[PDB]
Amino acid sequence: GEELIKENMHSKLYLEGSVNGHQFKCTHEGEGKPYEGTQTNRIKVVEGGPLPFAFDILATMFSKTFIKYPKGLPDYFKQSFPEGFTWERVMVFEDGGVLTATQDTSLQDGCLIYNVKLRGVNFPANGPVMQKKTLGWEPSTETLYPADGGLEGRCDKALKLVGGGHLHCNFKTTYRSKKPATNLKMPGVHYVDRRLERIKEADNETYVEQHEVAVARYCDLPSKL
Amino acid sequence: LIKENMHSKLYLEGSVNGHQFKCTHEGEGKPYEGTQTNRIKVVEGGPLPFAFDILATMFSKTFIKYPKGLPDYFKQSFPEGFTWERVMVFEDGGVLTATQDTSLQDGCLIYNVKLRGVNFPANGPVMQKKTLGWEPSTETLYPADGGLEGRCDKALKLVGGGHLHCNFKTTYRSKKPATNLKMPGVHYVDRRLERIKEADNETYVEQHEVAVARYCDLPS
Amino acid sequence: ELIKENMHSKLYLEGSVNGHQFKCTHEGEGKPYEGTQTNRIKVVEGGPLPFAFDILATMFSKTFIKYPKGLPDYFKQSFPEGFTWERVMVFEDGGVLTATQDTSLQDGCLIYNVKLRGVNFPANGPVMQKKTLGWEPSTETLYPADGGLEGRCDKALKLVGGGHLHCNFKTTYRSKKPATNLKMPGVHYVDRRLERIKEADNETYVEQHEVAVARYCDLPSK
Amino acid sequence: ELIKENMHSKLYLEGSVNGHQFKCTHEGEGKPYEGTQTNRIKVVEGGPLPFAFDILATMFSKTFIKYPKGLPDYFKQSFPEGFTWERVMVFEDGGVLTATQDTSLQDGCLIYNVKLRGVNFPANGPVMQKKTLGWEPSTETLYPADGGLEGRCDKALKLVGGGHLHCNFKTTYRSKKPATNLKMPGVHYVDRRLERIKEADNETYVEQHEVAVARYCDLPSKL
């Protein structure tokens, strides 16, 4: 399972979304150092382009294998191979936009395969997302909690706005291996710090190039117990 | 165009907590009486590991009784029909989004639902199949540049005696140009959705809805 | 029964919204069995307020609901000892209000004491920018729960410019009379129309009128 | 600033949760530049409480955060005419607490005043049934806004039987003194561990230790 994810790994994705009515589809092509926690992947909007909303809200649909897990904090995601794993997410924007996606991860030919299917609705016509007034996400810390053999993630994220300020978004994810969790080693409560940046945009966001660095940790601070 | 008797057909794809499924329905009703019954099959992914009640409202806005002075946004929209899109937020954290297309094809109402549900607690009246249908409800409809926005607090009755509350937000959007629709003011739709019959671990379900629109009749 | 066809009410309210402190009082009258009342409200300390008074409108009387025959009136049965309510209002743009009240009866006058705390009201939103024009009429749903009633209500403020600011209400109503001395209603609905009738001096004098009528679901069944 | 190696606090709190009025005070001591402190909390009135004390844990100290050099400390610059916070806490089972706080400095000593109001905590849920086992460690993201700060914090209470109960926190932090008499931080994080050390007499007496350390995002930026 460890011995299967490799010091350089590749991802191909297929995606199928609808946001405020607008159907679309995307693919991507990706690579990174999983054990160093880094990846970059190139995204296309194969159908539905150009999109009438800020691409940024989709940014986090495109990779939980590429988290740097230190020795002695179990990697739920790498362990889950060769079967793979699946996440379920709800994103709730402070202005009423709501997004829900289910993603399917798996491996084939030493190449990671993501199937995404998402559904966005109730985004205000006048608001920064439907106005394309977003300038990318702030770094974030996700807390992962073990629960029923899965992990539940929580994350308060914030999208940067033109003029300054931020649009806030709450994330709630459920991560579920497809191995039996009797064949797994669960971590405790732990934290994943990230910074996801757009590094290239083209043809009105129908081509987008993204980099993530993700590092996991236990809470380092001294107890009194 | 919308006759005093109308038939509907429904195809539905969904996913709830990663469990994928499909349904279809054949429905019959009285668009101007505000009544209908429809016969639902789960045809992939059944039997379902959660209460089918949470999908009840996925399965018909053309069947609301609109009194004479109160413009009917749904019946007006034909022949080109309308769409809706909804979020349901349960008080225990489960969230469903859903999108719907309503069209009119050679006399029949055709419905197409895609939905996606996540974060339902595992234990968990929804996931432990401990629900006993919805209470009657009142939806408030607000015009909102050219579409309607609905707001509704609903509650599922529970095995044991309580209620699981759920907050609905929906956006109704006519495919017709807005200039060809008289827009209603703010109004209310009182409903009672009931389960008539179920068989084979909720893989077959019959539902009946009655639904009557009104202005606020209180004086001023 | 101690609820007459005509009753008066007296209110004292103490409040903090985004850290701005204030107090109100009111004297009101209405017709309990017809479902109508008028309250004359003063902002007696901390005025004029830096926020839309409209958010406070629903803080000012459940005894005045018209209950039809065979729908138990939880609030009128609660006397002589009365009842309390606790409410959370969550606005769609982040404002949140918690509030609690006491309703009692002294010398046949209804007496309301209200405490409230409101926070996180955005500086550029319609509440703080004073852009609201009153509430839409509404339906509150009431559910029996372990001796009390849980109320649920999605509401909306009209805005300058035409749209609405939505608000979510969750209230718990608890009788001060032991519960087996009351007949509880099943699940039911309260239709309302609350309106501002007059105002003066930068929104520091307000009069409001409520009509409220309860009903069971009237639609046919099976 | 005027905040010494060692500092004490006294605190007075009054509030209502699901109708139940109470009042609290703490005496306190700690080290503000290594961001640690202990607080000995007394339920003077309304004891014992029908609800879990844990839900008040965070009501009881923003100057005791360790800020590294190069990240402005809003709270230490915000003195002598100090600062305030207004918080909303939304538990996933429906409990909602609002609360507001005053932080002033009067002759060697930190003064805390808190008023809170909690409603809609379900009667059969862990808070009213007292099935909680403390808070998990947390991180707060703090954003500049109008020369104030907005804190956002997903937090979790350990439960009996092993689950968690989650609670969303939103807090506005506002200095009582103007700008510029003060430098603003950028978007930054505070990592925290709150621990109950000692409990007595059905939760009427309680000792809390907090370690709080701020940082910027430490990760590589490709832009």
Author numbering:
A (entry chain A): 5 to 66, 70 to 232
B (entry chain D): 8 to 66, 70 to 230
C (entry chain C): 7 to 66, 70 to 231
D (entry chain B): 7 to 66, 70 to 232
How did the manuscript describe this experimental structure?
Unlike dyes and QDs, FPs are genetically encoded and can be particularly useful in live cell FRET imaging. In all FRET biosensors, choosing optimal FRET pairs (donor and acceptor fluorophores) are key to the high performance of biosensors in living cells. Indeed, the variety of engineered FPs with improved optical properties has made it possible to tailor FPs for FRET pairs with high FRET efficiency and develop highly sensitive FRET biosensors. Given that the chromophores of autofluorescent FPs (directly from amino acids of protein sequence) are centrally buried in the β-barrel structure with a diameter of about 2.4 nm, the effective distance for autofluorescent FP-based FRET pairs is less than 7 nm, resulting in practical maximal FRET efficiencies of 40%–55%.
With the development of two-photon FLIM (2pFLIM), FRET imaging has been extended from cultured cells to living animals. Due to the limited number of FLIM-FRET pairs, however, it has been difficult to simultaneously image two molecular events with 2pFLIM in vivo. Developing new FLIM-FRET pairs compatible with existing pairs is required. Many 2pFLIM sensors use EGFP or mEGFP as donors due to efficient FRET with RFPs and high photostability under 2P excitation, and it would be useful to develop a new FRET pair compatible with GFP-based 2pFLIM-FRET pairs that would enable imaging of multiple biochemical events in the same cell in vivo. For this purpose, a cyan-excitable orange or red FP like CyOFP1 would be a good starting point as a donor, as a single 2P excitation wavelength, for example, 940 nm, could excite both donors. CyOFP1 has an unusually high QY of 0.76 and decays as a single exponential with a long lifetime of 3.66 ns, which makes it attractive as a 2pFLIM-FRET donor, but also has some bleed-through in the emission channel for EGFP and is not fully monomeric. A red-shifted monomeric CyOFP1 paired with a far-red acceptor with high EC, for example mCardinal, could function with a GFP-based 2pFLIM-FRET pair to monitor two molecular activities simultaneously in vivo.
